[PDB]
Design an enzyme around this catalytic site. Structure first.
Site, PDB file in Angstrom:
ATOM      1  N   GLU A   1       6.169 -17.624 -46.892  1.00  0.00           N
ATOM      2  CA  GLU A   1       6.004 -17.312 -45.293  1.00  0.00           C
ATOM      3  C   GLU A   1       4.847 -18.378 -44.989  1.00  0.00           C
ATOM      4  O   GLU A   1       4.027 -18.832 -45.688  1.00  0.00           O
ATOM      5  CB  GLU A   1       5.747 -15.960 -45.038  1.00  0.00           C
ATOM      6  CG  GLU A   1       4.467 -15.598 -45.343  1.00  0.00           C
ATOM      7  CD  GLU A   1       4.050 -14.113 -45.369  1.00  0.00           C
ATOM      8  OE1 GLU A   1       4.810 -13.565 -46.157  1.00  0.00           O
ATOM      9  OE2 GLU A   1       3.338 -13.617 -44.548  1.00  0.00           O
TER      10      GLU A   1
ATOM     11  N   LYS B   1       4.344 -16.163 -34.066  1.00  0.00           N
ATOM     12  CA  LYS B   1       4.714 -15.306 -35.374  1.00  0.00           C
ATOM     13  C   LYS B   1       6.304 -14.938 -34.981  1.00  0.00           C
ATOM     14  O   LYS B   1       6.426 -14.242 -33.810  1.00  0.00           O
ATOM     15  CB  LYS B   1       3.965 -13.946 -35.401  1.00  0.00           C
ATOM     16  CG  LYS B   1       4.220 -13.307 -36.394  1.00  0.00           C
ATOM     17  CD  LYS B   1       3.361 -11.973 -36.418  1.00  0.00           C
ATOM     18  CE  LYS B   1       4.095 -10.576 -36.640  1.00  0.00           C
ATOM     19  NZ  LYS B   1       3.465  -9.072 -36.590  1.00  0.00           N
TER      20      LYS B   1
ATOM     21  N   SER C   1       9.278  -2.696 -38.973  1.00  0.00           N
ATOM     22  CA  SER C   1       9.319  -4.219 -39.047  1.00  0.00           C
ATOM     23  C   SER C   1      10.783  -4.689 -39.467  1.00  0.00           C
ATOM     24  O   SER C   1      11.777  -4.048 -40.131  1.00  0.00           O
ATOM     25  CB  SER C   1       8.426  -4.554 -40.251  1.00  0.00           C
ATOM     26  OG  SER C   1       8.649  -6.114 -40.572  1.00  0.00           O
ATOM     27  N   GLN C   2      11.231  -5.728 -38.745  1.00  0.00           N
ATOM     28  CA  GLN C   2      12.507  -6.594 -39.415  1.00  0.00           C
ATOM     29  C   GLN C   2      12.400  -6.738 -40.755  1.00  0.00           C
ATOM     30  O   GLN C   2      13.530  -7.075 -41.262  1.00  0.00           O
ATOM     31  CB  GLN C   2      12.485  -7.850 -38.735  1.00  0.00           C
ATOM     32  CG  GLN C   2      12.702  -7.835 -37.168  1.00  0.00           C
ATOM     33  CD  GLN C   2      12.713  -9.258 -36.456  1.00  0.00           C
ATOM     34  OE1 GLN C   2      13.882  -9.650 -36.214  1.00  0.00           O
ATOM     35  NE2 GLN C   2      11.753  -9.502 -35.907  1.00  0.00           N
TER      36      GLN C   2
ATOM     37  N   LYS D   1       2.070  -3.370 -46.574  1.00  0.00           N
ATOM     38  CA  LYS D   1       0.665  -3.383 -46.064  1.00  0.00           C
ATOM     39  C   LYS D   1       0.239  -1.820 -45.601  1.00  0.00           C
ATOM     40  O   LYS D   1       0.934  -1.081 -45.373  1.00  0.00           O
ATOM     41  CB  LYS D   1       0.672  -4.239 -44.492  1.00  0.00           C
ATOM     42  CG  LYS D   1       0.939  -5.596 -45.048  1.00  0.00           C
ATOM     43  CD  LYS D   1       0.757  -6.504 -43.543  1.00  0.00           C
ATOM     44  CE  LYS D   1       0.608  -7.945 -43.569  1.00  0.00           C
ATOM     45  NZ  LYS D   1       2.023  -8.401 -44.041  1.00  0.00           N
TER      46      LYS D   1
HETATM   47 MN    MN Z   1       6.557  -4.328 -34.915  1.00  0.00          MN
END
Ligand code: MN
Ligand code: MN
Ligand code: MN
Ligand code: MN
Ligand code: MN
Ligand code: MN
Ligand code: MN
Ligand code: MN
EC number: 4.2.1.70
Lengths: 292, 292, 292
Positions: free
Chosen positions: C25, C85, C136-137, C155
């Site tokens: 990434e 982002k 999150s995706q 995370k």
């Molecule tokens: Mn989010």
């Protein structure tokens, strides 16, 4: 049309392509019932299969090999040697590691879809557990894979509202076999309504329509426990309120079910066995007529 | 290459493939508006379609038959006879049983995708309801099916934060048509921001990019209600807090919308009709340019 | 079969023939680390790649163009000029608009899958945030797209229980690289168990089994932070409890990691850099052996 040639994933299918078939999970026999009743049920399901003219394909993983149409001796060996409980995501590691594994509904539907089995039978599916963070791969699989699943709804230990709502969200069609009442495993009544159909031909017309419109979802055909054996849900609820959940992950379901057998002095086992047997009969009728 | 031949699922398309087309649900006409306003909205939309040079294909199910491009007479019959409200999962049931059904956004995108319609128009989509257990099939469909959907965001009766967050989770792209404000149906502002685009050409560049990269998701093109009809969200919220929710499942949305019409003496109805008409205009502009 | 020819989506791949490849990434370099440390890490990772015999393909979007295998000089431009982002859903938007964008895990796996990259490396994935509405995706992508992802778990800022449960629900397979403990980014210890694998050959066996059985999911290969850089999770939690979350949407993650750098006196920055480097090594070993 030219597909890959398998090397690591060996499927041993004992199913005649030209003959009706019903797929069935292994975890009910290995983790969900006591040994004696587990083998008695297997034998009875096989008897029903002969009576009705379909092949019962119990699915499991034996030392990394996927077997569709396990024998009694294989099932006994599995119980004796031990087998992990596997849903869909666990199939690869057990295959890679050469382990025994007992499949849940998610793995059973996943595997059935890859070997030409269209009708699957269970007792009750997984779903959203109380707390709404723990959610079965069963829901994911039914939202991803096309099959006709015969069940007595969802297991009684679940968050019923959250599960019933998520079945809608995920576009999982439901039909009551001669009832408009969404069944709840040990219990006939939920106070939640589903569409009622009257016969297996209606099931097949819905399912064929799903195929034509490329709707890749499981059709849940809901079959209530026979009245004689049912335990009203209001009664199950209250027992569940006394049980401290001491475990997590895949042990949750077996743990609570075993506790309920202890608490009702076998009443839930009788109910569970009765609905499993009735579901096998209905699944067989569907499989036989599908094959026409 | 070689596809199946349909038997059960008969689609009657009244679309000329060589002319631009916008798909539209039926539930807004049958369940979401009173009859007089519904038919005047239908007529106004057709007038816009003739003025701008696109076909307005109102989609519904008449006695089990999927009709793409319903007529005013057919819509009146549906209203008079009654129709089930159907999302995606209910299509097969109603087709099999030969029932009338009025489609929601999920069912409408799903069918549009199977008949070559790429632009769909609605007022507001479904989402996550208060409590976060009740979640519309609209989100699942938008996360599964590619189309350009013009709407005024999500319906005001929803858990706005939960819905907006889940649209991101599900990888559903959102763009404001000449605004960076996420609209909220009756209200122009939600307090949340989206990326802005300036014209139809920019919509189509995003859409075409999605096709090239095999992103099978709905592109939501967001169009706020005209300012002279908008209702501030806090007002709608305070009203909603005074309503006891006496229904469940599919009835929730039309129940709450009808209650709000009564509580605001038609204010919300006039907003809803205004945004539906403007959304038809924008959808038609996209459809016309897409056609090249 | 004959696929479309691309117009809008220009993909410039710098990947050469006859060499293993690891995808990576850009947002870590652009939004996740200070400039100096990010450029330092990029150079280190390239060194490891030349020495070990794989291609490190840092993926980003440069004025609308998708680039696989960005140079140091391009990365530097991106930092100086700015970059949005982007997860998966934002790719088409930034491609259409001709903007710079730094990819998250979701976008990186999505793109990698379209250009034939099978091994992807990150530090920690996204997941379910505290409150359980922000998700999150990354989770959706991993439940949709097949790849081998090397990470140090999820995370540390996340709802760990919720995330861990949802990885199961979505059918995302997990394996611990020489550990049975699910790692937590800065921390080795979660108290949550995963199956332990001993070498890269075991990873490849699991992955090849997934292909053969048509399981389209990301395999998470879990590599804990080195012990010398480890921070106990409870220590991280205690610090997160002192933070008012002042932001929403994509800004949440960087906002919180920065605050942790500040409160911890560079300690998290140093841990982050160490795990990213170790993860690069492991992903390279996987890439090299996969190619055989
Ligand atoms: Mn989010
Ligand atoms: Mn025996
Ligand atoms: Mn078809
Ligand atoms: Mn679980
Ligand atoms: Mn392409
Ligand atoms: Mn408010
Ligand atoms: Mn609902
Ligand atoms: Mn295969």
């Amino acid at each position: 049309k030219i597909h890959h040639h398998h090397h690591h994933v060996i499927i041993e299918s004992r199913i005649e392509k030209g003959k009706p078939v019903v797929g069935m999970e292994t975890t009910v026999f290995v983790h969900g019932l006591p040994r004696k009743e587990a083998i008695e049920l297997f034998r009875r399901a096989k008897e029903i299969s002969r009576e009705k003219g379909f092949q019962l394909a119990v699915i499991g993983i034996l030392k990394g090999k996927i077997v569709a149409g396990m024998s009694e001796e294989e099932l006994e060996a599995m119980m004796r040697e031990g087998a992990d409980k596997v849903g869909t995501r666990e199939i690869p590691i057990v295959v890679a590691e050469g382990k025994n594994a007992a499949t849940t509904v998610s793995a059973t539907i996943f595997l059935s879809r890859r070997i030409g089995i269209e009708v699957v039978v269970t007792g009750g599916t997984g779903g959203v557990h109380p707390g709404r963070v723990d959610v079965s791969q069963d829901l994911t699989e039914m939202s991803s894979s096309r099959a006709v699943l015969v069940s007595s709804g969802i297991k009684s230990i679940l968050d019923v509202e959250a599960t019933f709502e998520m079945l809608e969200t995920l576009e999982i069609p439901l039909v009551g076999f001669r009832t408009n009442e969404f069944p709840l495993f040990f219990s006939r009544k939920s106070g939640r309504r589903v569409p009622r159909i009257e016969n297996v031909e209606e099931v097949l017309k819905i399912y064929e329509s799903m195929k034509e419109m490329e709707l890749e979802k499981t059709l849940m055909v809901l079959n209530p426990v026979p009245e004689e054996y049912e335990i009203p849900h209001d009664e199950i609820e209250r027992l569940l309120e006394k049980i401290e959940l001491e475990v997590e992950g895949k042990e949750v379901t077996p743990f609570l079910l075993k506790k309920l057998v202890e608490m009702t002095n076998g009443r839930t086992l009788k109910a569970n066995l009765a609905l499993l047997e009735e579901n096998v009969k209905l699944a067989g009728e569907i499989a036989v007529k599908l094959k026409r």
